[PDB]
JSON list of C-alpha atoms in Angstrom, two decimals:
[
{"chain": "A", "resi": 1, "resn": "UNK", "atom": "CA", "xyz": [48.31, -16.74, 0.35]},
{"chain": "A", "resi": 2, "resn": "UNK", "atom": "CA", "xyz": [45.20, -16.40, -1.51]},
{"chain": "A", "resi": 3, "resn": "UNK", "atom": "CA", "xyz": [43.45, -19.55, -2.54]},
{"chain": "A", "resi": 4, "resn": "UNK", "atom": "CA", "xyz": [39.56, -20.82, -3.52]},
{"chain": "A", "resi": 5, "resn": "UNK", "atom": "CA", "xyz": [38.87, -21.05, -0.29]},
{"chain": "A", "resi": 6, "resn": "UNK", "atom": "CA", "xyz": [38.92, -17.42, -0.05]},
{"chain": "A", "resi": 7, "resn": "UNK", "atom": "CA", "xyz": [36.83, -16.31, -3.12]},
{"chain": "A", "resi": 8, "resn": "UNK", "atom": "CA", "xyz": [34.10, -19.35, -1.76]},
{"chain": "A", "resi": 9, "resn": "UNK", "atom": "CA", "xyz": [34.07, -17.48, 1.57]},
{"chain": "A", "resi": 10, "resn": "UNK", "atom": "CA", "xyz": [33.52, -14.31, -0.30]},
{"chain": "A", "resi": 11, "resn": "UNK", "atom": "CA", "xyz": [30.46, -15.10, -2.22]},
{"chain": "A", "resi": 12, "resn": "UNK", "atom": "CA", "xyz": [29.14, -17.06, 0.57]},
{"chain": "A", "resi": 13, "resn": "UNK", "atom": "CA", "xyz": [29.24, -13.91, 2.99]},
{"chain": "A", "resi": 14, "resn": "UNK", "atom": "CA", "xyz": [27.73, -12.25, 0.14]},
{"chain": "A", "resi": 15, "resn": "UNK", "atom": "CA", "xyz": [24.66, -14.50, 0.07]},
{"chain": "A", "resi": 16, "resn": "UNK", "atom": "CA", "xyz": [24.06, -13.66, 3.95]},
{"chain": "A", "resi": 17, "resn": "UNK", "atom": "CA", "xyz": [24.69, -10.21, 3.50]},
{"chain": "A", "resi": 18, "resn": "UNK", "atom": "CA", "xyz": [21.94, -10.25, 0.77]},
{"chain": "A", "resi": 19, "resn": "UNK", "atom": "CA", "xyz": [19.62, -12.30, 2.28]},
{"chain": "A", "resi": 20, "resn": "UNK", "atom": "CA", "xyz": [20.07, -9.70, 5.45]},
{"chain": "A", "resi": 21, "resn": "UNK", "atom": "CA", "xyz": [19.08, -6.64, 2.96]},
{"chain": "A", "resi": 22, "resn": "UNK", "atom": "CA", "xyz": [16.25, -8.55, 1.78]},
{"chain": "A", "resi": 23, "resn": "UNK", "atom": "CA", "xyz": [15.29, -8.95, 5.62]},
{"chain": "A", "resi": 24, "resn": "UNK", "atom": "CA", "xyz": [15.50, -4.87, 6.05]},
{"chain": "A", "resi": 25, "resn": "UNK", "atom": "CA", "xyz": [13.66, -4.30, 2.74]},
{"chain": "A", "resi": 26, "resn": "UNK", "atom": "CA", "xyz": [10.89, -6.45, 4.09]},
{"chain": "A", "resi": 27, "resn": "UNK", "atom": "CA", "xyz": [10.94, -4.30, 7.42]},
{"chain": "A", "resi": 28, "resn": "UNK", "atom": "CA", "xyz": [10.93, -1.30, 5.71]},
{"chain": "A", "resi": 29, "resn": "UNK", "atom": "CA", "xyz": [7.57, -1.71, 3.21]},
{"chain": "A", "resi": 30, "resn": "UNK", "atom": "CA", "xyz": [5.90, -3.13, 5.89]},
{"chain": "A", "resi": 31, "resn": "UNK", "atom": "CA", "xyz": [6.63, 0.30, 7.89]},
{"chain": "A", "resi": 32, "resn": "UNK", "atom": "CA", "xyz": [5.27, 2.16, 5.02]},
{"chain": "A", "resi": 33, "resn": "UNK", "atom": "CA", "xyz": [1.96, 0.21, 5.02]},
{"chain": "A", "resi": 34, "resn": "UNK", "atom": "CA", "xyz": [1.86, 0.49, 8.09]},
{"chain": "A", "resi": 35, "resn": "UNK", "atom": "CA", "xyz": [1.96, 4.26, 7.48]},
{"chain": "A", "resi": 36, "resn": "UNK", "atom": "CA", "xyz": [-0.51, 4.24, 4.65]},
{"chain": "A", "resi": 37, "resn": "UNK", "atom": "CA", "xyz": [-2.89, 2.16, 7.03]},
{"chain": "A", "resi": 38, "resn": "UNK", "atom": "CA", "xyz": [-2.86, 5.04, 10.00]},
{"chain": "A", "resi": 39, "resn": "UNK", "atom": "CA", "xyz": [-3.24, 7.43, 7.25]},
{"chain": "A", "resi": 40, "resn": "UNK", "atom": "CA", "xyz": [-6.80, 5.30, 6.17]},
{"chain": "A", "resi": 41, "resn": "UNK", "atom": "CA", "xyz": [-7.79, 5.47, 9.29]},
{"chain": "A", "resi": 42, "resn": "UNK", "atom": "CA", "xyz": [-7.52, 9.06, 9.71]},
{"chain": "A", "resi": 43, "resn": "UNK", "atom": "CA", "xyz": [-9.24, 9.65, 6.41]},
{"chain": "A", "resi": 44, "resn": "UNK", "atom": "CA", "xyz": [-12.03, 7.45, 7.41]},
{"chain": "A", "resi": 45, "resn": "UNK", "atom": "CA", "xyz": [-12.61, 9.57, 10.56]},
{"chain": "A", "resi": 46, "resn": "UNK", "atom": "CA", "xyz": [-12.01, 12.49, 9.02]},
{"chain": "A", "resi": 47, "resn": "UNK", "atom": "CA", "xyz": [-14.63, 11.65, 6.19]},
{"chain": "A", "resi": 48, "resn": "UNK", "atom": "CA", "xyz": [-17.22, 10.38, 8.99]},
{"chain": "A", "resi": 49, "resn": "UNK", "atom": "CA", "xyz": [-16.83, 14.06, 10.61]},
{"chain": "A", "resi": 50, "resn": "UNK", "atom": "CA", "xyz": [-16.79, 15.80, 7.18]},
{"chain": "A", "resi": 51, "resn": "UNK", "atom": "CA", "xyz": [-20.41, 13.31, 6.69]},
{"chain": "A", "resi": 52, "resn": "UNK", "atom": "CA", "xyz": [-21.71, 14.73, 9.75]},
{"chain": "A", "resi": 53, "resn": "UNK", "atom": "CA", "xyz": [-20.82, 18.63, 8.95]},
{"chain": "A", "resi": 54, "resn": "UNK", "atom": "CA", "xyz": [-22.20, 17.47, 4.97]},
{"chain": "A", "resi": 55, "resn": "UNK", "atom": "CA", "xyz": [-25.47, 16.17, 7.14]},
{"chain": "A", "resi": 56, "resn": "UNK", "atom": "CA", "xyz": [-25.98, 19.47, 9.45]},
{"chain": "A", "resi": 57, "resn": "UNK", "atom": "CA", "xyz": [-25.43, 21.71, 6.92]},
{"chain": "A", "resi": 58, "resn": "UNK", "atom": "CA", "xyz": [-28.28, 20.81, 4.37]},
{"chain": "A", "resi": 59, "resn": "UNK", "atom": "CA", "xyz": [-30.35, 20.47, 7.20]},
{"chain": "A", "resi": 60, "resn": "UNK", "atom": "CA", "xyz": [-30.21, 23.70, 8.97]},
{"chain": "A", "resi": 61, "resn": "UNK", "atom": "CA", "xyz": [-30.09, 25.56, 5.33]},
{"chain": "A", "resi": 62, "resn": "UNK", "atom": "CA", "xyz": [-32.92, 24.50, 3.53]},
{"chain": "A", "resi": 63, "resn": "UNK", "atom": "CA", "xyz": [-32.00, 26.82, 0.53]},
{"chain": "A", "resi": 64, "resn": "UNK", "atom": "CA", "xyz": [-29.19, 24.40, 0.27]},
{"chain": "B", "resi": 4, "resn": "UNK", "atom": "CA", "xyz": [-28.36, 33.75, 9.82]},
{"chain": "B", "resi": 5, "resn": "UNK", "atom": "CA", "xyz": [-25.37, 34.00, 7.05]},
{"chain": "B", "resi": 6, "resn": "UNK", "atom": "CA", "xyz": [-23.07, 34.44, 9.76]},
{"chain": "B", "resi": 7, "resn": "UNK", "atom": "CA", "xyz": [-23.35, 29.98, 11.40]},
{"chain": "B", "resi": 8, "resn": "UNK", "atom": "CA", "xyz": [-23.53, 29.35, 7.27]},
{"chain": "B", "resi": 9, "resn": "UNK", "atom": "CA", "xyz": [-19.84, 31.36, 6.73]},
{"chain": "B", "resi": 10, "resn": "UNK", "atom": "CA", "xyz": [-18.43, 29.71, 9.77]},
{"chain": "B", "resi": 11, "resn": "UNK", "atom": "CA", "xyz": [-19.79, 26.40, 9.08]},
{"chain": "B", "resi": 12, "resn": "UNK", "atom": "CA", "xyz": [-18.72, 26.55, 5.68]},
{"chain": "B", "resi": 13, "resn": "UNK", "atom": "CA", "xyz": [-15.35, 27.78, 6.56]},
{"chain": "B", "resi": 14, "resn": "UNK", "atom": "CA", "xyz": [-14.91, 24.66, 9.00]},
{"chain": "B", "resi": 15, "resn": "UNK", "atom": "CA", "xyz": [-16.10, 22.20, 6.15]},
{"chain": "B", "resi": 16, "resn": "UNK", "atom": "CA", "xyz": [-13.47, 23.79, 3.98]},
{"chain": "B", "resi": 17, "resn": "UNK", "atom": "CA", "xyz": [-10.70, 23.32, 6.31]},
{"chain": "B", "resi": 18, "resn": "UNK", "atom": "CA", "xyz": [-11.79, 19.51, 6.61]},
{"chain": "B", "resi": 19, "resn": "UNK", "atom": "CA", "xyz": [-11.91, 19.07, 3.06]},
{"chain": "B", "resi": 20, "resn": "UNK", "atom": "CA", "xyz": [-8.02, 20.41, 3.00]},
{"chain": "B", "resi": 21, "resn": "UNK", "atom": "CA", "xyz": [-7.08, 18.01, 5.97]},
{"chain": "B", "resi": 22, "resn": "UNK", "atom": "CA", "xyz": [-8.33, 15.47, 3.63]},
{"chain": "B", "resi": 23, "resn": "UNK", "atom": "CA", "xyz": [-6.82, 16.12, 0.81]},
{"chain": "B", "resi": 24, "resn": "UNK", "atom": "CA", "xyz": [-3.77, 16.22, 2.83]},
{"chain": "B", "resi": 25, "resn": "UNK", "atom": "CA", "xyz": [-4.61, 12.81, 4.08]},
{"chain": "B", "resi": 26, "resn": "UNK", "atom": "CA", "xyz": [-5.27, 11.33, 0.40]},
{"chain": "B", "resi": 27, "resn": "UNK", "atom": "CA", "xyz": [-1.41, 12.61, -0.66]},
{"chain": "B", "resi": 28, "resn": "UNK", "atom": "CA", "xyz": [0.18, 10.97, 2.53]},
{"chain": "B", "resi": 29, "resn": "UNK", "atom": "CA", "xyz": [-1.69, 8.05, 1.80]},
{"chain": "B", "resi": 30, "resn": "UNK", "atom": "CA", "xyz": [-0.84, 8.02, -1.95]},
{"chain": "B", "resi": 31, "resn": "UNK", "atom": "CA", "xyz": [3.05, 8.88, -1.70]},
{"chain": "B", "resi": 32, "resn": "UNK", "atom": "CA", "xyz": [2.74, 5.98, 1.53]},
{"chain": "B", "resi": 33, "resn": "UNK", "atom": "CA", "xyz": [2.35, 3.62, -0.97]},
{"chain": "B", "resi": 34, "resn": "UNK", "atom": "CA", "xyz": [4.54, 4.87, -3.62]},
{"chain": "B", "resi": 35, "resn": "UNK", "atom": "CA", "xyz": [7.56, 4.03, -1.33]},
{"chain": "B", "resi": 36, "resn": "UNK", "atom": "CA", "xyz": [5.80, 0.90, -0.56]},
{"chain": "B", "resi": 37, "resn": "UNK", "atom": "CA", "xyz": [6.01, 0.02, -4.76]},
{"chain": "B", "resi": 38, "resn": "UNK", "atom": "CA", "xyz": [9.41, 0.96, -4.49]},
{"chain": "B", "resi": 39, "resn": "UNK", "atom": "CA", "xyz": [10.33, -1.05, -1.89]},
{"chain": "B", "resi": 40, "resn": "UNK", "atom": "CA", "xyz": [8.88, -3.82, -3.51]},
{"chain": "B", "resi": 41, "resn": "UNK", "atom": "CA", "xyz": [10.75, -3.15, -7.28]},
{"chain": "B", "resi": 42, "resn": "UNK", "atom": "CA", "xyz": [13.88, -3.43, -4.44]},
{"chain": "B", "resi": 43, "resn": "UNK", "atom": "CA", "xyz": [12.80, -6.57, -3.12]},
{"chain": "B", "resi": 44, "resn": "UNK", "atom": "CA", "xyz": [12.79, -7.95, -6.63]},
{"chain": "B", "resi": 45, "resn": "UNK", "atom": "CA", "xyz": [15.74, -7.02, -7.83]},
{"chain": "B", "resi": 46, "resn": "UNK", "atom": "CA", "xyz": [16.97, -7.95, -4.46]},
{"chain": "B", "resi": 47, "resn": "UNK", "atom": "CA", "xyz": [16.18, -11.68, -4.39]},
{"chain": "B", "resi": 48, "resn": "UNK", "atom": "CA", "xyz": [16.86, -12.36, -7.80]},
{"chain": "B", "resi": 49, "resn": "UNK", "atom": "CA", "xyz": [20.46, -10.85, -6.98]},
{"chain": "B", "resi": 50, "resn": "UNK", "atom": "CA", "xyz": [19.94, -13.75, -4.38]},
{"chain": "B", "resi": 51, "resn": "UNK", "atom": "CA", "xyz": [18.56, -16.51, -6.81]},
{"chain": "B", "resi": 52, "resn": "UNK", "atom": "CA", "xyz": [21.49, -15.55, -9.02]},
{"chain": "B", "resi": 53, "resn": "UNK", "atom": "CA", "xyz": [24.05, -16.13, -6.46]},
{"chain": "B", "resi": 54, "resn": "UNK", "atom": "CA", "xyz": [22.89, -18.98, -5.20]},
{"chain": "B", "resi": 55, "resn": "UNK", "atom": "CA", "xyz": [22.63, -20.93, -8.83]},
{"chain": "B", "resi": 56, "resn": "UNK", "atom": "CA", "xyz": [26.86, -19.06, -9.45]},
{"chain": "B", "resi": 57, "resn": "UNK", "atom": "CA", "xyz": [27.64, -20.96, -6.48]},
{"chain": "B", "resi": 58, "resn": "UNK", "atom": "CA", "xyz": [26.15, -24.43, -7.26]},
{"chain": "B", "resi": 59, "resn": "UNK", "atom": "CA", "xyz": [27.70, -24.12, -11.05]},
{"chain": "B", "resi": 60, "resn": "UNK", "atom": "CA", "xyz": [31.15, -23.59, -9.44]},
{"chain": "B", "resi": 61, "resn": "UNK", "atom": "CA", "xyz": [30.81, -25.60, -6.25]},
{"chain": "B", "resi": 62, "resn": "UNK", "atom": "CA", "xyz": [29.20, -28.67, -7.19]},
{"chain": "B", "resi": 63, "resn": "UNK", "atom": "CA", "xyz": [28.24, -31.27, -10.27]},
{"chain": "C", "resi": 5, "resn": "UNK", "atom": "CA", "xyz": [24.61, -35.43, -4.33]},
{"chain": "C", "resi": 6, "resn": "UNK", "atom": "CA", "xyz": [21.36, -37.16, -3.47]},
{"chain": "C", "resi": 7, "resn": "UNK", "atom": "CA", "xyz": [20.60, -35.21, -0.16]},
{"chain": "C", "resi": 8, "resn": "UNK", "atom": "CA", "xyz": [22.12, -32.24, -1.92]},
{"chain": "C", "resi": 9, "resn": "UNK", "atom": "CA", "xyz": [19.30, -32.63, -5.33]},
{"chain": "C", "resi": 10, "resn": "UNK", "atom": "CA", "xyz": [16.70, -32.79, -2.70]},
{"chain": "C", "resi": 11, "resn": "UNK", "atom": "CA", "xyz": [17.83, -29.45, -0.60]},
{"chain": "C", "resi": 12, "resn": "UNK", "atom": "CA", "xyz": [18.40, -27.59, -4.11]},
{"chain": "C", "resi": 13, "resn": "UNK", "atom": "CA", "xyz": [15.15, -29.08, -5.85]},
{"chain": "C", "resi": 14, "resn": "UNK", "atom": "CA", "xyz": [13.07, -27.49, -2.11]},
{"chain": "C", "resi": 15, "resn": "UNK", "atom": "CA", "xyz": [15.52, -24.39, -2.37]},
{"chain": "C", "resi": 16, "resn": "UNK", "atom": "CA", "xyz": [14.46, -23.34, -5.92]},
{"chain": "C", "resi": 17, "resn": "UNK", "atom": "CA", "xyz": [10.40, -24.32, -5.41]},
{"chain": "C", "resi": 18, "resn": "UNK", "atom": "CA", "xyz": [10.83, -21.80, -2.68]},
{"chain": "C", "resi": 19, "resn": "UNK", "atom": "CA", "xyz": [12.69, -18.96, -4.54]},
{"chain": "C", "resi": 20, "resn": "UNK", "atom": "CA", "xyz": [10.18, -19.09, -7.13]},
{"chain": "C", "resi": 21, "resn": "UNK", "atom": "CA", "xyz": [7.38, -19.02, -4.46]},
{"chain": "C", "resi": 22, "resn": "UNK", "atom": "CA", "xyz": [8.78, -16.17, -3.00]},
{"chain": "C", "resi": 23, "resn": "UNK", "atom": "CA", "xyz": [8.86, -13.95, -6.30]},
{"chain": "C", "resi": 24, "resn": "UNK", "atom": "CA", "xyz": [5.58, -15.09, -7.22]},
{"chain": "C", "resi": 25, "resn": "UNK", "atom": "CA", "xyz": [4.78, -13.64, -3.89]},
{"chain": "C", "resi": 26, "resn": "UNK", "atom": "CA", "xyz": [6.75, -10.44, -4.61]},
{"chain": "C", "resi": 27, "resn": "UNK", "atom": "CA", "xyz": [4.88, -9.81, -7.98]},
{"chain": "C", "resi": 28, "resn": "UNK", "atom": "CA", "xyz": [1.06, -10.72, -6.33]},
{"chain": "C", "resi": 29, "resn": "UNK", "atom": "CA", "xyz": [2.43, -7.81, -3.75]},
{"chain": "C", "resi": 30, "resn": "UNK", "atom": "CA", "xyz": [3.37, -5.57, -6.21]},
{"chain": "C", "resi": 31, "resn": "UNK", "atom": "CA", "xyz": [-0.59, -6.29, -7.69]},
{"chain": "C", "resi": 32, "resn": "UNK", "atom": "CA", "xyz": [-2.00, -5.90, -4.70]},
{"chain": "C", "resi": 33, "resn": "UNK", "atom": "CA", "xyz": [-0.65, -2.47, -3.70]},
{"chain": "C", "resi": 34, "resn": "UNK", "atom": "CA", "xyz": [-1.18, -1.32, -7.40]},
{"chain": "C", "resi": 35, "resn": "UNK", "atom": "CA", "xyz": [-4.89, -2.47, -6.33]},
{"chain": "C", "resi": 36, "resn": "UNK", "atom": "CA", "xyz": [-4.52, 0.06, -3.19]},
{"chain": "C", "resi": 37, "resn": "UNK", "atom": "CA", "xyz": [-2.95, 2.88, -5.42]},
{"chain": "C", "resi": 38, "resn": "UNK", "atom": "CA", "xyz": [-5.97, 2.79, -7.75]},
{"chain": "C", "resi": 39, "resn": "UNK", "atom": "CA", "xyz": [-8.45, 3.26, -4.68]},
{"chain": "C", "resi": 40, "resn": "UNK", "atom": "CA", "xyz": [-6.51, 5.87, -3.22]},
{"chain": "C", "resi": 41, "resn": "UNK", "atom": "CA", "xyz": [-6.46, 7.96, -6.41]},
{"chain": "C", "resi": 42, "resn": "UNK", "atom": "CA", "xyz": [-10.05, 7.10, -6.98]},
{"chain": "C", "resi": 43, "resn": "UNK", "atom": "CA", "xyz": [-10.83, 8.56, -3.41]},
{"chain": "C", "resi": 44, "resn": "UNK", "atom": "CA", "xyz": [-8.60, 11.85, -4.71]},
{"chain": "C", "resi": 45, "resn": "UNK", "atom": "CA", "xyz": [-11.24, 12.46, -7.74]},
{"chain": "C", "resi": 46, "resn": "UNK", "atom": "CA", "xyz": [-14.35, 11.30, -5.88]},
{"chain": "C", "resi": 47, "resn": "UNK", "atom": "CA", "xyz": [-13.46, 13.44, -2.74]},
{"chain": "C", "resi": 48, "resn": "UNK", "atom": "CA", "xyz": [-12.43, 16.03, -5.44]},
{"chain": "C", "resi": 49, "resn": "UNK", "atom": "CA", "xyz": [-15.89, 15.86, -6.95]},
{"chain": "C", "resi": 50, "resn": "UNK", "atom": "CA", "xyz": [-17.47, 15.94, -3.73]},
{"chain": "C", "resi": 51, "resn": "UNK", "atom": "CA", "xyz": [-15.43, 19.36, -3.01]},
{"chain": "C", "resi": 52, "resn": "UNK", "atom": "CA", "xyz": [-16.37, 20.77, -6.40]},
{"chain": "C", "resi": 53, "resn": "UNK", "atom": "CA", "xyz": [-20.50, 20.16, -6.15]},
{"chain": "C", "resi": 54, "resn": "UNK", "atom": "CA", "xyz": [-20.39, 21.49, -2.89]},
{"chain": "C", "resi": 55, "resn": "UNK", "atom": "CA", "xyz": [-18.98, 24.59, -3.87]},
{"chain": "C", "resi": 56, "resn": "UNK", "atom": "CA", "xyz": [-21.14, 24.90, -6.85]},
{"chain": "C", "resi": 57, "resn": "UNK", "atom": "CA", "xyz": [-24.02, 24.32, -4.13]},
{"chain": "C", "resi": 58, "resn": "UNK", "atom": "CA", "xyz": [-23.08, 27.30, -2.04]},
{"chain": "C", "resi": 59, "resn": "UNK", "atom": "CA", "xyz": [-21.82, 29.55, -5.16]},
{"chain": "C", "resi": 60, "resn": "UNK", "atom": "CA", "xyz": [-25.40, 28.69, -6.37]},
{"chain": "C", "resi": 61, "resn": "UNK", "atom": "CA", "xyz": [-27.77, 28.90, -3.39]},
{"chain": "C", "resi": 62, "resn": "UNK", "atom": "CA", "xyz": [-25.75, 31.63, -0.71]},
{"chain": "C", "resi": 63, "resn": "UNK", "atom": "CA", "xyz": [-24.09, 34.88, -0.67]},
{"chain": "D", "resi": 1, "resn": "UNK", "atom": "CA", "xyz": [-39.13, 27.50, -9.71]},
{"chain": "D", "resi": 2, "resn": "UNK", "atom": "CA", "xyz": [-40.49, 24.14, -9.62]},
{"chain": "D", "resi": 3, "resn": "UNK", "atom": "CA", "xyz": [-37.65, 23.70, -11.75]},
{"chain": "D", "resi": 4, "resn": "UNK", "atom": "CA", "xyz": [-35.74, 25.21, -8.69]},
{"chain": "D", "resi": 5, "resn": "UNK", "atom": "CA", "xyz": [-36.99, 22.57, -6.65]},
{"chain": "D", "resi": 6, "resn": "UNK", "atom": "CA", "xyz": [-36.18, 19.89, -8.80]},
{"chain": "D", "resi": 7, "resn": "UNK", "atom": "CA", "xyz": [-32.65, 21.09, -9.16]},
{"chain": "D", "resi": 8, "resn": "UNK", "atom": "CA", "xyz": [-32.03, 21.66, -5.68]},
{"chain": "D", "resi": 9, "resn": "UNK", "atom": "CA", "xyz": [-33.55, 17.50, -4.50]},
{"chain": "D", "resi": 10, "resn": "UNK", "atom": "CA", "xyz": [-31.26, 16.70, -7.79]},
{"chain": "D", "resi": 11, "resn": "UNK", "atom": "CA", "xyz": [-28.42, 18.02, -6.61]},
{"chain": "D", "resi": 12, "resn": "UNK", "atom": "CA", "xyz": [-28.73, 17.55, -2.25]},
{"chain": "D", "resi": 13, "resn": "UNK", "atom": "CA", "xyz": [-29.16, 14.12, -3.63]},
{"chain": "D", "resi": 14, "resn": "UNK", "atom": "CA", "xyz": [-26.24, 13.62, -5.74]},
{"chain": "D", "resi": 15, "resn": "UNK", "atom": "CA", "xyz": [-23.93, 15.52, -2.42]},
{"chain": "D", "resi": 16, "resn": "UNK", "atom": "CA", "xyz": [-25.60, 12.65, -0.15]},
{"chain": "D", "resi": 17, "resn": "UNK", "atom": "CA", "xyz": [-24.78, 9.81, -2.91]},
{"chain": "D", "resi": 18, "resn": "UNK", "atom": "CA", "xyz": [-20.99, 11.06, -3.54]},
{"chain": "D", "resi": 19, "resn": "UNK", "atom": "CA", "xyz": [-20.17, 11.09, 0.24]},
{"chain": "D", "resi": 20, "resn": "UNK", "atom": "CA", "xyz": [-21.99, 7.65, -0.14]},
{"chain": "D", "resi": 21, "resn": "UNK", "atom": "CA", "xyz": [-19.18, 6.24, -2.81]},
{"chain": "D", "resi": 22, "resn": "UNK", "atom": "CA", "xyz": [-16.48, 7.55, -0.48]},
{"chain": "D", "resi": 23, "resn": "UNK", "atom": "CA", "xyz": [-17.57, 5.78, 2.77]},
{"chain": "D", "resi": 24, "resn": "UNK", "atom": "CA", "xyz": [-17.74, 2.92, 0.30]},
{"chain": "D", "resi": 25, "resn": "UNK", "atom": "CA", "xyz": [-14.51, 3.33, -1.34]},
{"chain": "D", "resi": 26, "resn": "UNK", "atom": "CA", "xyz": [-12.93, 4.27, 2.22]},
{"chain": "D", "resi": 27, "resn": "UNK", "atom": "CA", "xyz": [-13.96, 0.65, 3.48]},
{"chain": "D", "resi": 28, "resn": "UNK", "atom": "CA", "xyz": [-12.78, -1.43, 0.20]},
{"chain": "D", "resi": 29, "resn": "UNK", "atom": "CA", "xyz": [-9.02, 0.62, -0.02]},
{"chain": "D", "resi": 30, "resn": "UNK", "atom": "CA", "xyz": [-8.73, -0.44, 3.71]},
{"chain": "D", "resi": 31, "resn": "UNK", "atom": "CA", "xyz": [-9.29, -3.90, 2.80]},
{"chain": "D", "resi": 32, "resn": "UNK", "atom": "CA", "xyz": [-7.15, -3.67, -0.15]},
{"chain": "D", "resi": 33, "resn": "UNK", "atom": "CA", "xyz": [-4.19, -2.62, 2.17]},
{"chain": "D", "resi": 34, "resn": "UNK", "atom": "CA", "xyz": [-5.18, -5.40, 4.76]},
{"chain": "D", "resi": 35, "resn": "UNK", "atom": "CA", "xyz": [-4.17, -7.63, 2.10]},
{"chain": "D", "resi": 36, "resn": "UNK", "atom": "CA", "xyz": [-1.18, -6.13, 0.82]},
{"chain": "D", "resi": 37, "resn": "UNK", "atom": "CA", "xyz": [-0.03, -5.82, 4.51]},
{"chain": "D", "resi": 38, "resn": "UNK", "atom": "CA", "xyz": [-0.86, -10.00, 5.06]},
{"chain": "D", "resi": 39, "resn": "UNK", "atom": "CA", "xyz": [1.50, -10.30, 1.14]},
{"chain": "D", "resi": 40, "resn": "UNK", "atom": "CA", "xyz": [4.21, -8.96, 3.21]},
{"chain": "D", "resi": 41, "resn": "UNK", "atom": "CA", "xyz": [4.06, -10.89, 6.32]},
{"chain": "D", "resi": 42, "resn": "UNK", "atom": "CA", "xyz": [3.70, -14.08, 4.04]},
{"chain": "D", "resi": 43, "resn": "UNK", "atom": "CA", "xyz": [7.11, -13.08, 2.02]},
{"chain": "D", "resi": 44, "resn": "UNK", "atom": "CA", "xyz": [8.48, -12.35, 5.79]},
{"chain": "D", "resi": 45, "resn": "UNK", "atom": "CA", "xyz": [7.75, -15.88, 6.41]},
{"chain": "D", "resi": 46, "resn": "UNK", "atom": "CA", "xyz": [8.95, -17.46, 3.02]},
{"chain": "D", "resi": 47, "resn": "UNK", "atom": "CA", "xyz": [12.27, -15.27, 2.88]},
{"chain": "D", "resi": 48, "resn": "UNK", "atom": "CA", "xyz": [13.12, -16.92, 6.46]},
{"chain": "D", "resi": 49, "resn": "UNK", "atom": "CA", "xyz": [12.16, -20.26, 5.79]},
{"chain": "D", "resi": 50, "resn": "UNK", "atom": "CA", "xyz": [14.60, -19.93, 2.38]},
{"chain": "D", "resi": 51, "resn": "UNK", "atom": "CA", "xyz": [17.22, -18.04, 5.26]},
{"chain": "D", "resi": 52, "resn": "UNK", "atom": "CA", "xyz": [17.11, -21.66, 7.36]},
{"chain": "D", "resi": 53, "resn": "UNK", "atom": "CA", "xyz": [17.32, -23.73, 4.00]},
{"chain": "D", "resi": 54, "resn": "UNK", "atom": "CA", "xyz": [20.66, -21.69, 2.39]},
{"chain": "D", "resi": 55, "resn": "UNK", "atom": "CA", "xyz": [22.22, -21.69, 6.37]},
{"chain": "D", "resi": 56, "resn": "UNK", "atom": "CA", "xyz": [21.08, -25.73, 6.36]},
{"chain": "D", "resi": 57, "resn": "UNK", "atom": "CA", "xyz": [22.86, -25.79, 2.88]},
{"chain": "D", "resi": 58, "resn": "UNK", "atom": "CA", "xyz": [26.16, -23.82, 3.41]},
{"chain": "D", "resi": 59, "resn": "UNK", "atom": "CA", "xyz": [26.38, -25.42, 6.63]},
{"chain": "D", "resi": 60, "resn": "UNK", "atom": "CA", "xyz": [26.39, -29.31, 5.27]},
{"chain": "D", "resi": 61, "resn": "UNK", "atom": "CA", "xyz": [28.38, -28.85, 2.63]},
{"chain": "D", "resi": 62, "resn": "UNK", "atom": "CA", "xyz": [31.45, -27.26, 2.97]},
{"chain": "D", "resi": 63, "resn": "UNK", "atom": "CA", "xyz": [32.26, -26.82, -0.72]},
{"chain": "D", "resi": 64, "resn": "UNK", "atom": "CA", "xyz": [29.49, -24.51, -1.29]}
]
């Protein structure tokens, strides 16, 4: 027999389940940055390389 | 000669693609980051909400 | 109902904390978003002048 | 073709100052992210310490 007791229990189990979510949506945006911050990284090596070939170029080719 | 210029130039090139490549990644890496983060809002005011719905019924 | 004002008073201070934390996030990675698209049209540029330097001064 | 000299130093210049701005923006996105990443840890923290304070509240008072 349905009473309060069950509609309390409801919204409470709702407030965990939410406040689980929010845990997973926390996990999951710091996975991204943690993407975006490899990606930086390889950009920044890949610009330091691209420097170098930028570098070597003008030097060997002086018409350049 | 012409010929380390055309190679070198075509290795430069290539780079200059991987980068580009690189920027987008980065770029659509932090759009779902944003999104995420519109979530998280939404998310914790759902939480706010039904937290203040269960003092207003529960208590004085 | 004493102990109970205290816990909600902490609770609330707390919730608002948190979204004032969620919207300086929100700033910061805009912050990011901006540099990255800044590096797209500087590294862009960069491209460009490089191959007007070669279209220029090679075969 | 002094002109042609000019030109060229003009422009080898400006290819040596644009890779310049990159490196520089390169090292200020990175510490953009470094602080987004750190926002995200500190609502990781908050969002738990608000997790102990609802379990502490639904667990003392029964009626809510």
């Amino acid at each position: 027999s349905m009473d309060e007791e069950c509609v309390l229990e409801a919204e409470n189990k709702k407030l965990v389940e939410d406040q689980e979510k929010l845990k997973t949506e926390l996990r999951k945006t710091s996975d991204a940055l943690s993407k975006a911050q490899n990606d930086v990284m390889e950009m920044k090596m890949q610009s330091e390389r691209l420097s170098k070939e930028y570098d070597q170029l003008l030097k060997e080719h002086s018409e350049l």
